[PDB]
Ligand SMILES: CCCCCCCC/C=C\CCCCCCCC(=O)O[C@@H](COC(=O)CCCCCCCCCCCCCCC)COP(=O)([O-])OCC[N+](C)(C)C
Ligand SMILES: CCCCCCCC/C=C\CCCCCCCC(=O)O[C@@H](COC(=O)CCCCCCCCCCCCCCC)COP(=O)([O-])OCC[N+](C)(C)C
């Protein structure tokens with residue numbers, strides 16, 4: 577397990593990515609993976625069970641949790657990571673397939689494929705950031721949430737678990753996503769400039 | 773325990789009360805006493821314990837009960853009965869004292885005392901009916917009560933016990949009080965007419 581092997585694996589051996597997409601994007605991806613691993617089960621592990629309301633009606637806790645957390649932050653970030661990494665995996669499979677098909681018996685199509693992949697990665701990053709903004713306005717979470725949904729009578733006080741730790745990790749993940757967006761835009765601009 | 777003794781005890785031997793205050797008012801008083809006895813502990817016995825709210829906060833049941841029942845119907849009717857019967861007791865003691873003081877050694881003063889007593893009885897009846905109207909508007913009680921008072925968070929659903937039975941007994945007691953008011957007014961008018 578040497579450094580050259582890991583660097584080649586993360587690069588995708590597409591021979592078209594510059595330093596800002598081969599040395600920096602991979603590092604940010606590793607950072608996001610590590611943060612998600614260290615915060616997936618320790619922080620968001622008991623988001624459902626430790627979440628309690630101040631009522632006595634059965635079934636109000638579950639409906640309140642589903643009302644205020646349509647999809648938890650960790651799962652949303654996992655989906656974002658998978659969809660962002662999908663175009664890179666597609667480009668890696670494309671270049672491997674091209675090497676295989678030329679082995680049994682080209683630059684422009686690979687360049688266009690890489691550019692389209694970076695554009696789609698940027699689009700997925702922006703879409704997931706916008707979805708996060710829609711579902712959870714603001715970067716901070718509150719301890720008290722007032723819920724008025726059936727079967728809870730009138731308005732009940734539900735209490736979120738670890739709002740501050742989740743706020744810290746939300747800040748970290750949003751900063752990483754913003755850095756990824758900036759790097760992808762810079763990579764697209766640099767490729768366009770070098771093409772012309 | 774003959775009928776003449778009970779009739780003399782209820783009349784007050786004031787020799788100034790007509791049939792509508794010596795035959796009918798005493799019967800209505802007995803009716804109210806009997807209804808209050810048969811409804812004081814059986815119906816309103818568990819008004820506090822069977823009264824529960826739909827919250828989990830400690831101490832919300834007591835504050836909600838005190839908010840919606842400042843003074844229970846049975847205690848209010850008991851106070852009304854005591855204060856209504858006080859002037860009759862005063863007149864009975866006055867006539868007994870007059871007999872005693874004339875025994876050891878007058879009509880106009882006794883007549884005026886009886887008239888003032890009937891006026892005060894009517895005033896107490898009206899005052900207690902108005903207080904009942906102020907505290908509990910309407911003759912009917914509802915199962916659900918929405919309470920928003922500290923420490924209960926937001927608005928909680930409290931459930932009264934036996935609203936329909938309490939409504940029935942409220943109707944009975946209010947009808948008896950109205951009959952008492954009408955009889956007292958008739959007695960005052962009859963005495964004034966006979967005086968002139
Ligand atoms: C996302 C979560 C991250 C967590 C934090 C991780 C922190 C860091 C943790 C771990 C990082 C790796 C630590 C061990 C590195 C040893 C490298 C080594 O000796 O290489 C040598 C041997 O290499 C081999 O032949 C294979 C060695 C396998 C290493 C482990 C593989 C994955 C383990 C999965 C574990 C799963 C469970 C993990 C926990 C869930 C290189 O080979 P060589 O023969 O020397 O090369 C030719 C010789 N010549 C050069 C002289 C010509
Ligand atoms: C608000 C609650 C209401 C409840 C519903 C009530 C429903 C009805 C219930 C009860 C009503 C009364 C029933 C018994 C009546 C007997 C009368 C009798 O025999 O009289 C005779 C005897 O009389 C006496 O010498 C005294 C008799 C006492 C009767 C009971 C007194 C109170 C009891 C309290 C109990 C406490 C516990 C009660 C429950 C808590 C009359 O005397 P005499 O010597 O014949 O006279 C002279 C003779 N000569 C005429 C021939 C010349």
Ligand SMILES: CC(C)CCC[C@@H](C)[C@H]1CC[C@H]2[C@@H]3CC=C4C[C@@H](O)CC[C@]4(C)[C@H]3CC[C@]12C
Pocket residue numbers: 585586587597598601602605661662664665
């Ligand atoms: C420029 C940056 C974004 C490049 C990042 C490369 C990512 C997308 C690539 C590099 C190595 C890849 C992994 C290599 C091998 C496997 C094992 C397979 O059974 C499941 C997929 C999985 C786990 C791949 C997922 C995608 C992956 C992590």
Ligand SMILES: CC(C)CCC[C@@H](C)[C@H]1CC[C@H]2[C@@H]3CC=C4C[C@@H](O)CC[C@]4(C)[C@H]3CC[C@]12C
Pocket residue numbers: 781782783793794797798801857858860861
């Ligand atoms: C015309 C109507 C209103 C007359 C009603 C008469 C009422 C006011 C009188 C008649 C007999 C009275 C009772 C006779 C004896 C006693 C025992 C005494 O230790 C306490 C008061 C008490 C219990 C009296 C309360 C008042 C009383 C009930």
